[PDB]
Amino acid sequence: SRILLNNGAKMPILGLGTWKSPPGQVTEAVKVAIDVGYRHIDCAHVYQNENEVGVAIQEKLREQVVKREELFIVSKLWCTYHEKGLVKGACQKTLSDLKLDYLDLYLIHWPTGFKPGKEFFPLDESGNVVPSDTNILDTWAAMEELVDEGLVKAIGISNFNHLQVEMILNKPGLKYKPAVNQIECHPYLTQEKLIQYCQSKGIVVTAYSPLGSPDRPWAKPEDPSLLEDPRIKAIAAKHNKTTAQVLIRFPMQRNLVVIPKSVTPERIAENFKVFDFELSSQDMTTLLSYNRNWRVCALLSCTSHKDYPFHEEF
Numbered sequence: 001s002r003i004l005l006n007n008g009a010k011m012p013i014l015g016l017g018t019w020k021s022p023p024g025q026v027t028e029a030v031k032v033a034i035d036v037g038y039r040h041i042d043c044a045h046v047y048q049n050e051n052e053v054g055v056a057i058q059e060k061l062r063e064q065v066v067k068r069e070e071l072f073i074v075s076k077l078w079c080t081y082h083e084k085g086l087v088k089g090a091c092q093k094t095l096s097d098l099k100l101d102y103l104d105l106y107l108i109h110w111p112t113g114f115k116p117g118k119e120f121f122p123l124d125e126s127g128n129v130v131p132s133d134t135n136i137l138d139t140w141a142a143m144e145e146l147v148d149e150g151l152v153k154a155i156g157i158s159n160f161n162h163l164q165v166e167m168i169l170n171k172p173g174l175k176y177k178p179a180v181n182q183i184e185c186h187p188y189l190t191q192e193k194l195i196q197y198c199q200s201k202g203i204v205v206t207a208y209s210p211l212g213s214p215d216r217p218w219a220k221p222e223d224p225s226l227l228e229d230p231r232i233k234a235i236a237a238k239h240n241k242t243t244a245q246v247l248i249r250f251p252m253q254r255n256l257v258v259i260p261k262s263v264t265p266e267r268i269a270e271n272f273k274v275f276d277f278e279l280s281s282q283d284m285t286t287l288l289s290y291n292r293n294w295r296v297c298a299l300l301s302c303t304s305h306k307d308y309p310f311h312e313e314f
């Protein structure tokens, strides 16, 4: 149920996602998740609900439902805080909101730094994101400091392509390797090349949007739908599982971590019931065959940033 990271710690391979969980619903979602066995929560400042996630964490700690050491809480540095002098404050605000004195894992949320200010996505008058002149290597050094200051136990990256991972791995004076790369991954974006690369370097990969993010705000009715794909339903039916359970078990059998989001108590519980069956090797290859290079998370306004990650092949 956990995977060993290159910092010596173990990470639960199933966690609860929180992007889009409404603030009025996410405290109960996180309390139910811990009650039915989740021990990893995926968070981010940019999701604007860390305070409410933190109320749930703190109540289950206070209630002695779980000990802090059994939890694995992940958050992410937003793009407007890549400047060396802003990274510690950004981490401390997340810590204060989550009511924690450390994070188990803190990620660079995207490789692109944006102009600092109140706006999460500062745009110029024609809608392009306004970059900052920070680069990923100085940001990485700032993340290493957080480990040395006790604020985080592990650091990692997210939405880094393989040349950007390689840039971190080849950073002069590198002190801590990234422990995780968290990337979009599901049967329509299988990521074989980038996962192989990261795993060969001992970097654990976390699969986000494993259900295809049906609640993403830019969904169009005509878009492909994993949960409604009859081929995936058929695999589910064969194992007497739901389609969501097959989509969650798939990355687990590729030695990935996976973080499905829900605020629906019944689905939170359903989504956790994925440790009592196995997809066959044939099932796994068939699921991989549905790759279409279809990406849910790739915002147009960011495509001209120098560090935009999805022009590269992987």
Ligand SMILES: NC(=O)c1ccc[n+]([C@@H]2O[C@H](COP(=O)([O-])OP(=O)(O)OC[C@H]3O[C@@H](n4cnc5c(N)ncnc54)[C@H](OP(=O)(O)O)[C@@H]3O)[C@@H](O)[C@H]2O)c1
Residues within 6 Å of the ligand: 016, 017, 018, 019, 020, 042, 043, 109, 158, 159, 182, 183, 207, 208, 209, 210, 211, 212, 213, 214, 215, 216, 227, 242, 244, 245, 259, 260, 261, 262, 263, 264, 267, 268, 270, 271, 297
């Ligand atoms: N690093 C990054 O850049 C990044 C980017 C995107 C996502 N992520 C992380 O990954 C998490 C998961 O990705 P995501 O939120 O994009 O989408 P997701 O987990 O693929 O899909 C969540 C959607 O699926 C529905 N759902 C959940 N379980 C279901 C089930 N058993 N049956 C039917 N529908 C179900 C949820 O509905 P209800 O909630 O209404 O039940 C919600 O609409 C995020 O929440 C975030 O923590 C990270």
Ligand SMILES: O=C(O)Cn1ccc(=O)n(Cc2nc3cc(Cl)ccc3s2)c1=O
Residues within 6 Å of the ligand: 019, 044, 046, 079, 110, 112, 296, 297, 298, 299, 302, 303, 305, 307, 308, 309
């Ligand atoms: O960031 C999250 O965890 C969730 N999320 C929320 C809103 C959204 O538009 N996106 C798509 C983005 N694409 C890029 C692309 C690049 Cl280069 C930087 C930032 C983003 S954000 C998104 O993924």
